[PDB]
Design a protein around this ligand. Structure first.
Ligand SMILES: *[C@@H]1O[C@H](CO)[C@@H](O[C@@H]2O[C@H](CO)[C@@H](O[C@@H]3O[C@H](CO[C@H]4O[C@H](CO)[C@@H](O)[C@H](O[C@H]5O[C@H](CO)[C@@H](O)[C@H](O)[C@@H]5O)[C@@H]4O)[C@@H](O)[C@H](O[C@H]4O[C@H](CO)[C@@H](O)[C@H](O)[C@@H]4O)[C@@H]3O)[C@H](O)[C@H]2NC(C)=O)[C@H](O)[C@H]1NC(C)=O
Ligand SMILES: *[C@@H]1O[C@H](CO)[C@@H](O[C@@H]2O[C@H](CO)[C@@H](O[C@@H]3O[C@H](CO[C@H]4O[C@H](CO)[C@@H](O)[C@H](O[C@H]5O[C@H](CO)[C@@H](O)[C@H](O)[C@@H]5O)[C@@H]4O)[C@@H](O)[C@H](O)[C@@H]3O)[C@H](O)[C@H]2NC(C)=O)[C@H](O)[C@H]1NC(C)=O
Ligand SMILES: *[C@@H]1O[C@H](CO)[C@@H](O[C@@H]2O[C@H](CO)[C@@H](O[C@@H]3O[C@H](CO[C@H]4O[C@H](CO[C@H]5O[C@H](CO)[C@@H](O)[C@H](O)[C@@H]5O)[C@@H](O)[C@H](O)[C@@H]4O)[C@@H](O)[C@H](O)[C@@H]3O)[C@H](O)[C@H]2NC(C)=O)[C@H](O)[C@H]1NC(C)=O
Ligand SMILES: *[C@@H]1O[C@H](CO)[C@@H](O[C@@H]2O[C@H](CO)[C@@H](O[C@@H]3O[C@H](CO[C@H]4O[C@H](CO)[C@@H](O)[C@H](O)[C@@H]4O)[C@@H](O)[C@H](O)[C@@H]3O)[C@H](O)[C@H]2NC(C)=O)[C@H](O)[C@H]1NC(C)=O
Ligand SMILES: *[C@@H]1O[C@H](CO)[C@@H](O[C@@H]2O[C@H](CO)[C@@H](O[C@@H]3O[C@H](CO)[C@@H](O)[C@H](O)[C@@H]3O)[C@H](O)[C@H]2NC(C)=O)[C@H](O)[C@H]1NC(C)=O
Ligand SMILES: *[C@@H]1O[C@H](CO)[C@@H](O[C@@H]2O[C@H](CO)[C@@H](O)[C@H](O)[C@H]2NC(C)=O)[C@H](O)[C@H]1NC(C)=O
Ligand SMILES: *[C@@H]1O[C@H](CO)[C@@H](O)[C@H](O)[C@H]1NC(C)=O
Ligand SMILES: C[As](C)(=O)[O-]
Ligand SMILES: [Ca+2]
Ligand SMILES: [Ca+2]
Ligand SMILES: [Ca+2]
Ligand SMILES: [Ca+2]
Ligand SMILES: [Ca+2]
Ligand SMILES: [Cl-]
Ligand SMILES: [Mg+2]
Ligand code: NI
Lengths: 591, 423
């Protein structure tokens, strides 16, 4: 609920390059500045005789928003022999998947075709280019001696990639072994050390990969999507992958052990052709230090009040228990044909409340099908099913839908405000937008009315102007506020009070002003004890009203001065969601 | 609990059983108060029949004199919270026009099939002549999106996709509309002989692209306005759907529009994704097309589960040479002659509806809007209960029609929240 939509960072690219098909953060070690990584897989390159080779742009966040293309490979197609090309980098979709870890950047080209070293073929094995601080190598694990469809010829390795916490690469290729799919994992050390420009089929020793299976497992698309997290409690990140066409288009999600490639758990879809396994994610949503599995199925159809099926999409939330079981909870979409659940991106603790949050996008929803991203907050019980914020696209379609939210990435504090930020990609209109999170203010208001049982014949407090005394009482309100991250130590609030809020004749009003209302500016300090201001209010004369039954409700309301409490850039903080901005007490009459 | 709520307008909002005396109380308790009937204002839910033409049965020589649903037009005034049950009666006529579109897989494994279908058009129209006087048949073909990785992209394999066997095969194509449906069954036979097999594919094929185009392109296919729109899907393998084209770099969703070029060919088989089942349903229902899955045993269970989601869709076991396709179509036709299911169009995401099927005379099914095992001429009654949760802005148009039939019942659901004393 704390994402700034007023003034986000808008990045763009060359038209038709699909700028925003893949987005990620790039933060090198220590003092070095922050950067954004946008993949434009249909972009023209300076590579000799190669049309739409694709490129990944390193977008700058400081000052101007220029994005300089990263040079992974400037060379053209190498030759197996004279006038006999070995590879086809044209339309290879380089930058379709961009993953970053510390200094390391990993981009891939799923549609990279390759000629067999034996016969003249054109097989899409797919390739990747890992880049360290200084070094830059090529990683094509499917480009091996295992040829044709039955092998890893149509593997399209790099279709989905991800890093682990132990500096290990997880790569997925859907087309291996007659589209059974395959998960390949290599150490980043062997990718750079065993690299050889003269060798096209590199054999790795410490390689973890899924073996070929029976013919019944064909057409499964294993490696369509990937994610990492610990699930057998050994410290090592395990492999999670979506298998959308498994079990006769029912959809499955495999989990392999990230140590020896052994099957741990696997989920299964409930509906036909809902694409169960299109997108997977792993993040601890309930704050129990256990990785929780998120699985998307955007084509899932749901039954409405009218008793009519409607495609809205569904995301299944499987909470991991220490017992080993999962507490699966399904979450449906909101708009029809919006494909809710296409992209699932963990946000870390967006509001810094104590529980990690997550974002789920519906790329083809909203007015004019611009795109919608929903933000869901985590809690002790699990994932709060109701979204706390809705991010809307702001750009119309040219020929292909804007796809605002088709690919996104968060959980990275780029402005050092203490709150993780979010990048949303819209390749349909060649855009990438960085939303900044706002500081969260938790305020504990208090209101005391003593005594609450008003005696109408008490007449204690004297009333200025006349000799007639009136029955009176005290109204006492206190304000305390405190937040986390970077935020002002001085906060200005505007406190407003209303006596007898519900009732018409007003039966009670303050002493100094003789008015039911009272305005008071209040400058409270962060983390300090609640400063409190007390005021005297008196009850009206008996002859001025006959309503002795209705209780007199004392109402207080406060609002933060966002203008003066704003950041240097103009990033205004925000009050917490569930905490009410107004509380009320009441008083009675003995009658 | 009307005594705690009540404003005359707000008095009626707190409950459908509440009323205002021009204090908010039930109309029964208002009489005890002494409030007169003309003072008691109750915008009670009610129906107003506009067009209730009786069901016309028997062979009707005049096409514009056939009525298969009763009533036809209903203005429904509903109170927020209150409910109303509608009696809808549907019955199929004896002689009704029939459109058939033979959509066939042209994979190399369908070669032996082609040698048996060579004289189907004449044979099919012969038997269908017994059942209906107006029968028009069309033809279409599909294989797969001609893009990697679905098809090999080497210059020799692009020219001849069966070069490895070797065998003479035409290049892989997405979908080719060939014959607009017509009465001439002899023209059908000539075209089947002219057809050639394309690539041999053991992977799922791009059949779904053809279905979307065969349903949306009304003019170019030639669907008659008041007839059964039968679509016979003939394949021997599975079919790709939705985001399966992400592997090919196709990331733009199907728009559910017609894209047959001047050559009658699916021009957007390299631009748009495969249609999704959610999409196919929305278009097959809107275009009133009844889909028939004629697949082999290796695909029956799979396509059986597809047909459960698609209203009006059935399946059938096809032989390896497809020599029983005539026996499948007619039997599938007779079943549709026995099936009567209801549809609701243009309704609300927020409106709740319930259906009870009244098959025969003394059989009443709960939570069912479909009847079966009924001979042609038998009546089928349904009870449709409509309720509005809130108050809403204005009236909304809804349509209740049978599956496969052109006849429809229009519903004008207009809410009421204002009081007569406020005028
Ligand atoms: C998650 O979900 C996945 C999906 O189901 C599960 O992963 C699958 O698990 C099953 C169960 O273990 C696996 O089935 C096994 O497959 C192996 C395959 O071995 C292959 O290689 C052998 C040579 O190395 C070869 O001999 C095999 O061929 C045999 O079988 C074919 C016909 O099937 C026959 O023609 C041959 O002549 C051979 O006889 C094959 O190519 C297989 O060896 C296993 O056999 C088990 O069962 C037999 C029963 O008689 C028994 O005799 C064996 O000793 C052995 O116990 C078994 O069938 C499947 O391969 C997995 N799929 C993938 C993609 O990996 C996974 O289990 C789920 N996880 C969890 C936690 O549940
Ligand atoms: C690849 O590596 C993995 C992990 O490094 C290896 O997994 C180990 O498998 C061996 C057996 O093959 C296990 O050895 C056993 O451990 C038992 C532990 O207690 C079991 O019984 C408990 C009930 O009393 C039960 O609750 C518990 O469940 C736990 O493990 C399950 C998986 O095995 C998991 O699904 C549950 O959620 C829970 O985590 C145990 O089953 C012990 O009692 C036995 O006598 C035996 O020694 C190891 O413990 C596994 N290591 C783990 C789980 O970390 C795997 O074998 C490797 N593959 C190959 C081919 O070597
Ligand atoms: C409690 O605390 C609140 C703040 O939280 C205090 O509110 C502020 O009070 C000060 C006075 O002490 C205000 O400052 C004064 O504002 C006068 C407003 O004049 C007119 O301004 C508008 C036109 O100019 C504005 O708009 C144009 C664009 O149209 C801009 O270009 C300008 O820069 C201006 O923004 C008119 O539309 C408007 O109707 C006014 O007639 C100004 O004339 C004075 O000279 C002085 O600057 C301050 O504006 C208040 N701020 C807010 C947010 O309300 C409050 O006083 C405190 N109470 C107590 C008791 O201390
Ligand atoms: C990367 O550089 C590429 C340069 O090759 C860019 O490719 C361009 O892509 C567009 C389509 O998006 C092509 O437009 C086409 O135009 C033809 C008409 O061309 C006529 O002339 C040719 C001879 O040149 C002839 O063969 C044809 O038959 C036509 O008579 C249309 O028919 C097509 O439908 C399509 O609209 C451009 O032609 C093409 N450029 C070139 C130089 O060919 C690509 O866009 C660049 N990438 C990005 C992201 O910008
Ligand atoms: C009649 O009305 C007057 C006015 O509200 C009431 O006076 C109130 O009395 C209470 C109780 O003494 C005061 O609270 C405080 O109690 C602490 C206890 O130590 C004491 O230290 C404070 O000095 C103060 O006494 C309250 O402030 C006071 N209010 C005012 C405006 O003077 C009185 O109690 C009522 N009498 C009856 C019988 O209802
Ligand atoms: C007093 O605070 C309550 C919250 O405790 C306010 O209730 C809001 O009511 C609106 C009604 O449309 C809801 O949309 C909000 O979600 C409610 N707030 C919360 C935090 O849930 C109430 O409006 C406040 N009273 C006044 C006069 O502002
Ligand atoms: C078919 O009926 C529709 C009304 O639903 C009408 O718009 C269309 O013009 C009609 N076509 C013919 C050929 O009568
Ligand atoms: C209004 As009626 C008799 O068609 O249910
Ligand atoms: Ca682990
Ligand atoms: Ca957890
Ligand atoms: Ca949180
Ligand atoms: Ca931030
Ligand atoms: Ca055959
Ligand atoms: Cl090339
Ligand atoms: Mg086939
Ligand atoms: Ni009381």
């Amino acid at each position: 609920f704390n994402l700034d939509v007023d003034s986000p960072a808008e990045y763009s690219g060359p038209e038709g390059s699909y700028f925003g098909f893949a987005v990620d953060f790039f933060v090198p070690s220590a003092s070095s500045r922050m950067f954004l990584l946008v993949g434009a897989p249909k972009a023209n390159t300076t590579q000799p005789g190669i049309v739409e080779g694709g490129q990944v742009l390193k977008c700058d966040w400081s000052s101007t928003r220029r994005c300089q293309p990263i040079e992974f490979d400037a060379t053209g197609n190498r030759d197996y022999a004279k006038d006999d090309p070995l590879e086809f980098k044209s339309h290879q979709w380089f930058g379709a998947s961009v993953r970053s870890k510390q200094d390391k950047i990993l981009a891939c080209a799923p549609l990279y075709h390759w000629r067999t070293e034996m016969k003249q073929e054109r097989e899409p094995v797919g390739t990747c280019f890992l880049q360290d601080g200084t070094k830059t190598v090529e990683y094509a694990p499917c480009r091996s001696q295992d040829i044709d469809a039955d092998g890893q010829g149509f593997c399209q390795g790099g279709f989905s990639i991800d890093f682990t916490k132990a500096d290990r690469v997880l790569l997925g290729g859907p087309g291996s072994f007659y589209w059974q799919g395959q998960l390949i994992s290599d150490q980043v050390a062997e990718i750079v050390s065993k690299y050889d420009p003269n060798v096209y089929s590199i054999k790795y020793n410490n390689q973890l990969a899924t073996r070929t299976a029976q013919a019944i497992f064909d057409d499964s698309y294993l490696g369509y999507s990937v994610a990492v997290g610990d699930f057998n409690g050994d410290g090592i990140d395990d492999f999670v992958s979506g298998v959308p066409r498994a079990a006769r288009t029912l959809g499955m999600v495999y989990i392999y052990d990230g140590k020896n490639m052994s099957s741990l758990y696997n989920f299964t879809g409930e509906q036909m052709a809902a694409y169960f396994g299109f997108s997977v994610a792993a993040t601890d949503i309930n704050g129990d230090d256990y990785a929780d599995v998120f699985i998307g199925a955007p084509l899932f159809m749901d039954r409405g009040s009218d008793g009519k099926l409607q495609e809205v999409g569904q995301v299944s939330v499987s909470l991991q228990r220490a017992s080993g079981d999962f507490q699966t909870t399904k979450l449906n979409g909101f708009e029809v044909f919006a494909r809710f659940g296409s992209a699932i991106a963990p946000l870390g603790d967006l509001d810094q409340d104590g529980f990690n949050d997550i974002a789920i996008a519906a790329p083809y929803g909203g007015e004019d099908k611009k795109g919608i991203v929903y933000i869901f907050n985590g809690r002790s019980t699990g994932l709060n099913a109701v979204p706390s914020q809705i991010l809307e696209g702001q750009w119309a379609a040219r020929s292909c839908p804007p796809s605002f939210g088709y690919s996104m990435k968060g959980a990275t504090d780029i402005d050092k405000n203490g709150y993780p930020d979010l990048i949303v990609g819209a390749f349909g209109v060649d855009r990438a937008i960085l939303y900044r999170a706002r500081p969260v203010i938790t305020v504990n208001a208090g209101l005391e009315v003593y005594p609450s049982i008003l005696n109408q014949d008490n007449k204690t407090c004297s009333l200025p102007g006349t000799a007639l005394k009136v029955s009176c009482f005290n109204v006492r309100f206190c304000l305390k506020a405190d937040g986390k991250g970077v935020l002002p130590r001085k906060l200005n609030f505007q406190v407003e009070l209303l006596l007898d809020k519900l009732k018409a004749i007003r039966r009670a009003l303050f002493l100094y002003s003789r008015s039911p209302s009272h305005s008071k500016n209040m400058t409270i300090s962060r983390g300090g004890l609640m400063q409190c201001e007390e005021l005297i209010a008196y009850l009206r004369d008996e002859s001025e009203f006959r309503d002795k039954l209705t209780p007199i409700t004392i109402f207080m309301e406060y609002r933060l001065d966002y203008r003066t409490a704003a950041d240097t850039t103009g990033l205004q903080p925000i009050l917490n969601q569930f905490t009410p901005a107004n509380i009320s007490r009441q008083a009675h009459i003995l009658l | 609990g009307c005594a705690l709520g009540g404003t005359c307008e707000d008095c009626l909002l707190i409950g459908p059983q509440c009323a205002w005396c021009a204090r908010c109380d039930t109309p029964a308790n208002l009489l005890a108060k002494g409030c007169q009937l003309n003072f008691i204002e109750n915008p009670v839910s009610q129906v107003e029949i506009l067009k209730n033409k009786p069901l016309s049965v028997g062979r009707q020589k005049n096409s514009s004199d056939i009525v298969q649903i009763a009533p036809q037009s209903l203005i429904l005034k509903l109170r927020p919270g209150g409910a109303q049950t509608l009696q809808v009666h549907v019955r199929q006529t004896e002689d009704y026009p029939v459109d058939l579109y033979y959509l066939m897989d042209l994979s190399a494994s369908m070669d032996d099939d082609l040698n048996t279908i060579k004289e189907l058009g004449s044979r099919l129209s012969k038997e269908m002549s017994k059942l209906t006087s107006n029968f028009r048949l069309g033809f279409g073909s599909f294989v797969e999106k001609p893009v990697s990785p679905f098809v090999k992209t080497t210059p020799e394999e692009i020219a001849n996709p069966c070069s490895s066997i070797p065998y003479f095969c035409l290049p892989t194509f997405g979908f080719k509309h060939i014959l607009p449906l017509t009465n001439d069954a002899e023209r059908f036979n000539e075209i089947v002989k002219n057809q050639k097999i394309s690539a041999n594919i053991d992977t799922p094929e791009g059949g779904f692209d053809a279905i979307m185009q065969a349903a949306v392109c009304k003019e170019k296919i030639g669907w008659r306005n008041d007839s059964l729109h039968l679509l016979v899907f003939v394949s021997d393998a599975d079919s790709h759907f939705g985001m399966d084209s992400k592997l090919a770099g196709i990331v733009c969703p199907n728009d559910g529009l017609c894209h047959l070029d001047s050559k009658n060919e699916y021009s957007m088989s390299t631009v748009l994704e495969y249609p999704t089942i959610g999409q196919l349903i929305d278009k097959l229902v809107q275009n009133n097309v009844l889909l028939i899955f004629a697949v082999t045993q290796e695909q029956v269970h799979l396509y059986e589960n597809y047909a459960k989601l698609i209203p009006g869709a059935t399946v059938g076991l096809l032989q390896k040479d497809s020599g029983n396709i005539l026996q499948l179509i007619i039997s599938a036709y007779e079943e549709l002659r026995s099936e009567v299911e209801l549809e609701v169009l243009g309704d609300t995401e927020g409106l709740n509806l319930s259906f009870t099927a009244i098959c025969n005379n003394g059989t009443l099914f709960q939570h069912q809007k479909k009847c079966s095992h009924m001979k042609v001429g038998d009546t089928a009654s349904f009870s449709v209960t409509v309720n509005i949760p809130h108050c809403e802005r204005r009236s909304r148009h809804i349509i209740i029609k049978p599956v496969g039939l052109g006849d429809a019942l229009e519903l004008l659901v207009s809410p009421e929240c204002n009081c007569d004393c406020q005028k």
